[PDB]
Design a binder for this molecule. Structure first.
Ligand code: HEM
Ligand code: HEM
Ligand code: A1CN7
Ligand code: A1CN7
Ligand code: H4B
Ligand code: H4B
Ligand code: ZN
Lengths: 415, 415
């Protein structure tokens, strides 16, 4: 009822009492830990009106507790107000301030997010008056423009209307607002990003004329109020990109790599007070490793370690010459150097993981804990030379929260 | 009751039914995952005679099932035989073959061990006739000599007498048979291995004349049958060491680093059929990263990244120049190259993690699963360019097993 987490690099002990407020389940049991299942059935998302008020009551109780006015009359009135509206409409609507609070705390509670030290500096765009795919496109272009801020990236989320019935449902079909296309070739190999080959062909299935190259920014596929989704090209002037060079190796430009400045996740579900927002794209800035390690070096992604090690003149016959590791570091020095040389916000895994430890200290003191997923918080390279490797972390599921959801093209009753 | 684990690099699915035979608890609950607590209270170790027979019965049932003679008469006789002996003596004794089986499967079930593909090729030394610290010393020297095999390392375990009362207890006070000493300096800094500063001073408290340098192989501290422990120097000719050079950088010899060939963990508790073996040192061979990443580069260990990056002429002002990562790779290329150039068995994290995936495929097919701790199975560098990063792993606690135990100098009623 009062759990301790240790840092074995510093011998610092934090005491977690926030996990007692926890609600949702984790997938782990007394006899099995599933802390390395990627998409647990508990992390994926259809609710009724009965269970709605406890969820609303719980959310309002913490919201008014956080504006220093818990249990007051303005609280007890809004409790009844939402109670009455849930009786009448079997749903309800958040105030603007309740929406901003819910969004920031969904991010705050995101236990797999290392970036959370900035959770309170999130810009919330209320798109709940949107009704059409063009409206969504317009709200998303504004989001992109604002969050990019000419390389001085800012955190933002845009929140489309909440689910109601289910078949009326706003969805961004893109997994990210800005992703590169993936095309299968004649021989079977892949041009561009192999992650998106399925989505890239869906866009061609709906009309996209593909420039069939590498870093072809995909179009947005926007579903409005359950209607069939529609294709929109983000104006290129809004899609900020960094060409990737190295500060030693001049052949690194010849690699011709580039990446988009803005990580902007669009397929998630935001849950606030029992309400489900099925389209809620949010963006921040990149940690170096997400591009240079995962995007560039996953076997199932661009998979460039071959060509980088070749041009580095590396012993590639022996696995134990660590040519893979050696080329991975250079690639990440290049992503960082490239982004910083262009004044595009980027953070290295050392700075970001140190900030997360600093963030954890804040959340244990002024909040009683910080839910954190070690499997995801440790960076995908050089893990133990970063402070998060040596920090025990308690993972538990708080709300408001971002949840996964099935892809719309497996559930959308088409036409 | 039939859990699926996915590999997201290969889209391979394994089906785990072995977790149903699981017994011990994990520390996780439905509402909290503790899969990143280092020493869970469930992983640490005093039992009575009542609970003893179910544990024995359970162990014998799987042992005779594995020699293709389950439920036979030779089984049902040994069931009764151990039953009777537990009535009479409130304990019992394993057959040699039952001891070899229990040991191999304790290793087999070690979910944080990436090396397990070799679990059946374990040499079991029965030291259960030992009675004195000199006897232990002699059994441990033979273990070291055999397991080292002049650099052609072989897996081995030496099993001292099982706990009985508790106050009669064989313990190796060293955490590993071969560790370097740690000495605090005048200014407070540390010479040698800072991990062992506490143990190094215990040895001086009992008489060790310290050569107060860096890589000073510690003496063994051996507790026999609950008596006060005694100091013994492993004959240096038995302690095989690798001086660490690089295959490019000739200044790397000037770093003057070296490491011992034999990883030989001595502080663990082996549980077999409810019996507790409090001294059971076991050894294999090193994965590169345990030395080059954790031993050499942990801030709380030798912490050499400073000096290596200096001599590499690295941009060390900016965190984002990744000088830490760049020096870490070279250090691990040097450990591997050094060990292989001396015909001392060593495995790189790429080969070892690929073998573990191959091992998992074997354990899911011919056993129904493989308990695995992702937090510990992923190597401490370049994690996602190794196949274990992308493999979901179910952690659960089977028996026979190795468990942690408190250090003897906090529990030993001294003199
Ligand atoms: C501001 C800079 C940010 C940084 C550096 C950052 C960093 C990261 C990283 C490295 C991950 C691991 C995911 C992966 O490796 O693919 C992650 C996950 C995540 N982040 Fe953050 N992020 C940032 C902003 C945000 C914002 C603004 C939100 C929400 C409003 C957010 C919510 C999440 C969520 C929901 C996850 C995934 C959890 C899951 O998979 O269940 N992040 N972040
Ligand atoms: C043969 C070569 C072996 C290799 C390459 C290997 C590799 C490893 C590695 C890298 C770890 C992580 C621990 C750490 O990072 O400090 C580990 C843990 C472990 N290994 Fe293996 N090991 C080997 C042999 C053995 C043997 C022979 C046994 C037992 C008879 C064993 C039992 C264990 C146990 C109990 C753990 C720790 C689990 C825990 O902390 O609860 N290993 N091994
Ligand atoms: C705003 C922001 C900034 C930043 N630097 N990085 C991120 C990554 O966030 C997420 C990343 C993923 C990746 C999911 N994986 C499973 C599939 F194989 C890819 C899911 C998710 F739900 C996220 F939220 C987000
Ligand atoms: C035989 C063998 C070969 C090989 N290559 N590596 C190992 C490492 O095994 C273990 C390593 C540790 C390290 C515990 N950490 C907690 C403390 F801070 C160090 C514990 C343990 F219980 C192990 F078993 C063993
Ligand atoms: C199998 C495993 O759960 C999966 O590969 C996880 C591991 N940890 C991760 N950590 C982060 N940040 N991102 C990821 O995609 C993953 N993938
Ligand atoms: C906090 C965390 O549990 C601790 O640092 C763990 C992480 N994973 C590890 N993995 C291995 N192989 N060895 C370790 O010592 C650790 N340490
Ligand atoms: Zn867990």
């Amino acid at each position: 009822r009062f759990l301790k987490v240790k840092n074995w690099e510093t011998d610092v002990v934090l005491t977690d009492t926030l996990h007692l407020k926890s609600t949702l389940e984790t997938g782990c049991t007394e006899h099995i830990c599933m802390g390395s299942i990627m998409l647990p059935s508990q992390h994926t998302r259809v609710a009724t009106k009965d269970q709605l008020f406890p969820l609303a009551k719980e959310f309002l109780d913490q919201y008014y507790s956080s504006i220093k006015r818990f249990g007051s009359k303005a609280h007890m009135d809004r409790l009844e107000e939402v109670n009455k509206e849930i009786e009448s409409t079997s749903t309800y609507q958040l105030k603007d301030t309740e929406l901003i609070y819910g969004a920031k705390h969904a991010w705050r509670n995101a236990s797999r997010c290392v970036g959370r030290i900035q959770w309170s500096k999130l810009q919330v765009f209320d798109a709940r008056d949107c009704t059409t795919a063009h409206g969504m496109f317009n709200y998303i272009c504004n989001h992109v423009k604002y969050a990019t801020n000419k390389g001085n990236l800012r955190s933002a989320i845009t929140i489309f209307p909440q689910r109601t019935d289910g078949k009326h449902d706003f969805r961004v079909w893109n997994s990210q607002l800005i992703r590169y296309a993936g095309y299968k070739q004649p021989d079977g190999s892949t041009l561009g990003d192999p992650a998106n080959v399925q989505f890239t062909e869906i866009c061609i299935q709906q009309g996209w004329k593909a420039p069939r190259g590498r870093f072809d920014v995909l179009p947005l596929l926007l579903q409005a109020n359950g209607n069939d989704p529609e294709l929109f090209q983000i104006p290129p002037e809004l899609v900020l990109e960094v060409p990737i060079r190295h500060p030693k190796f001049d052949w690194f430009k010849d690699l011709g790599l580039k990446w988009y400045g803005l990580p902007a996740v669009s397929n998630m579900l935001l849950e606030i007070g029992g309400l489900e927002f099925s389209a809620c794209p949010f963006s921040g800035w990149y940690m170096g490793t997400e591009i240079g390690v995962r995007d560039y070096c996953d076997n199932s992604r661009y998979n460039i370690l071959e060509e980088v090690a070749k041009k580095m003149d590396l012993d590639m016959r022996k696995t134990s010459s660590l040519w893979k590791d050696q080329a991975l570091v250079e690639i990440n020095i290049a992503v960082l150097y490239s982004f910083q040389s262009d004044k595009v916000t980027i953070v290295d895994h050392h700075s970001a993981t140190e900030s997360f430890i600093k963030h954890m200290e804040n959340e244990y003191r002024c909040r009683g804990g910080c839910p954190a997923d070690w499997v995801w918080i440790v960076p995908p390279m050089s893990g133990s030379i970063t402070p998060v490797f040596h920090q025990e972390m308690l993972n538990y599921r708080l709300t408001p929260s971002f949840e996964y959801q099935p892809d719309p093209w497996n559930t959308h009753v088409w036409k």
